[PDB]
């Protein structure tokens, strides 16, 4: 996925979980949540981008 497309979609799914309640309800910016999560997962070697 091109990075921007990926992060936007991620922010979308994260909204499915602000509609959830049991893990980190974003109420400031789901897009910001997507950014931070992508940062972490890259940091965990999960996802590497060329």
């Amino acid at each position: 996925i091109p990075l921007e497309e990926a992060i936007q979609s991620l922010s979308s799914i994260l909204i499915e979980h602000v509609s959830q309640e049991q893990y980190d309800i974003n109420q400031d910016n789901p897009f910001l949540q997507a950014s931070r999560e992508l940062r972490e997962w890259i940091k965990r070697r999960l996802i590497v981008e060329r």
């Binding site: 890259i42 940091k43 070697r45 996802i47 590497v48 981008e49 060329r50």
Partner: peptide, 10 residues
């Protein structure tokens, strides 16, 4: 030396 944070942009 500085390694590879696994993100070319980084």
């Amino acid at each position: 030396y500085l390694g590879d944070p696994g993100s070319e942009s980084k």
